[PDB]
Design a protein that fits this description.
five-stranded parallel beta sheet; globular; binds acetyl coenzyme *A; ligase; Tetramer
């Protein structure tokens, strides 16, 4: 029935959905701002229409009514939002489904439940998936100390500020509880005059584990194993590997089963990611991303399952096993390991500020075990400051994690992007580290390894 699909996004994810639609025999429609007129994704579609005229380009890509008008005028039957712009916007999906179009994503109840921290926590508690294990809703200093007694140490507080502000207090010594709560409440009453006091069990050096979930409208929910997104610079993802080679396979299966149980309890449809924090055989639920992730490519590599094609086919209403052809959960293969590096314009010698300018040289590696998902990184492209810093996603996969590391080193040295500074020396330093190659990297690994910032002098004749 569905014949034409509009992508309400830009960059590499728009090209990825375009490739999936062309492989599924669907016509493609692109949208682009005036400042994004030289984007690759504009010319990779059958139709391209300017949206958000007279607006800021990132506001143009958030224009719900303009995108819906373009989809209606072009005859598009479906809208794929990609990620990061309107993929989790409840109003956009509501208006798209009210216009008669197909929103390639989860249902509206999933979108508002996982777009709200309280609702997501309530769903996780209903599905018996443990979060960060404290009596957080208790508001008392005596409540805080008894909370410290019943589960344990350390304890990190939210007495400083309500929304988006954390106390972040290190509590180890038994007297440090008492005087730290004293100073924390003394600072808390003077802070803003009004707020909310929350308690939280602090997790020291956790592992960020995400489980990829696919679900159709018929009720079949499968997981596509997990990814390790622990390599993070200031709570921002740098390198994601799949599967979590550091963790034992039975523990990874347990985490994936917990994610499957949660998504089956909420009745999840289409693609989604369940995030976790992992520490010494304990895992804690954090969030559900109700959209396709940037690092879905390594899951595709290690499972052999086209996630975007499955997204479109589930949006068509097809069964996960009968019509799409995905096997049962026990028959989902683990084809090996895979590493994703996001090459951006962030200059690591300049405090990871996104560089701008014209790319004069672009050479892309290839060969065995290499996957490329390029954005706008061609030679002669002018890097605008409006959009994301990402140039190209490079994915290396092999039967063994060590060969994936070796191939990633080969392609990071082979990659030649000139005219703008890239994070390639930082990525080389990270994959050269013995913690990452062993797979024992945690979320605090980047900030606690200053040797990653010693970049050698490049001659550049
Ligand atoms: C297929 C693979 O496995 S490649 C994996 C690693 N890639 C390479 O070794 C590519 C060849 N080597 C190089 O280009 C460089 O010497 C590097 C990558 C080792 C060092 O990087 P840089 O310091 O920034 O470049 P360098 O100053 O040394 O070389 C200058 C130019 O001579 C070129 N060059 C490099 N090797 C040769 C060569 N054997 N013959 C002719 N030109 C060469 C480089 O391409 C470079 O051009 P560029 O500006 O487009 O990058």
């Amino acid at each position: 029935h569905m014949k034409k699909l509009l992508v309400a996004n830009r960059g590499e994810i728009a090209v990825r959905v375009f490739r999936a639609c062309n492989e599924l025999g669907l016509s493609t429609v692109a949208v682009y701002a005036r400042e994004d007129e030289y984007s690759v994704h504009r010319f990779k579609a059958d139709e391209s229409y300017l949206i958000g005229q007279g607006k800021k380009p990132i506001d143009a890509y958030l224009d719900i009514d303009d995108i819906i008008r373009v989809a209606l005028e072009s005859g598009a039957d479906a809208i794929h939002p990609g990620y990061g712009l309107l993929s989790e916007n409840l109003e956009f999906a509501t208006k798209v489904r009210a216009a008669g179009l197909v929103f390639v994503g989860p249902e509206l109840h999933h979108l508002d439940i996982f777009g709200d921290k309280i609702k997501a926590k309530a769903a996780a508690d209903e599905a018996k998936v443990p979060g960060i294990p404290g009596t957080n809703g208790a508001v008392d200093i005596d409540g805080a100390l008894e909370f410290a007694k019943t589960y344990g140490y350390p304890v990190m507080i939210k007495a400083a500020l309500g929304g988006g502000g954390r106390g972040m207090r290190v509590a180890r010594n038994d007297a440090e509880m008492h005087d730290g709560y004293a100073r924390a409440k003394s600072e808390a009453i003077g802070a803003f005059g009004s707020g909310e006091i929350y308690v939280e069990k602090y997790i020291e050096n956790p592992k960020h584990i995400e489980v990829q979930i696919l679900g159709d409208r018929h009720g079949n929910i499968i997981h596509l194993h997990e990814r390790d997104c622990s390599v993070q610079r200031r709570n921002q993802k740098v390198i994601e590997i799949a599967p979590a080679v550091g963790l034992s396979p039975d523990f990874r299966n347990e985490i994936c089963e917990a994610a499957v149980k949660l998504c089956k309890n909420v009745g999840y449809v289409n693609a989604g990611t369940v995030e976790f924090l992992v520490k010494d055989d304990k895992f804690y639920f954090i969030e559900v991303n109700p959209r396709v992730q940037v690092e879905h490519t390594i899951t595709e590599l290690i499972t052999g399952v086209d996630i975007v094609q499955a997204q479109i086919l589930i949006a068509q209403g097809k069964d996960l096993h009968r019509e799409i052809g995905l096997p049962a959960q026990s028959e989902i293969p683990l084809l090996g390991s895979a590493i994703q590096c996001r090459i951006t314009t962030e200059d690591p010698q300049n405090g990871f500020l996104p560089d701008t300018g014209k790319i004069d040289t672009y050479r892309s590696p290839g060969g065995f075990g290499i996957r490329l998902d390029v954005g706008n990184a061609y030679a002669g492209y002018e890097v605008t400051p409006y959009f994301d810093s990402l140039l190209v996603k490079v994915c290396t996969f092999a039967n063994e994690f060590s060969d994936s590391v070796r191939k990633m080193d080969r392609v990071l040295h082979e990659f030649r992007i000139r005219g703008v500074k890239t994070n390639i020396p930082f990525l080389i330093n990270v994959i050269a580290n013995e913690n990452f190659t062993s797979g024992q990297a945690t979320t605090t690994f980047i900030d606690n390894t200053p040797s990653l910032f010693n970049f050698p002098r490049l001659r550049d004749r």
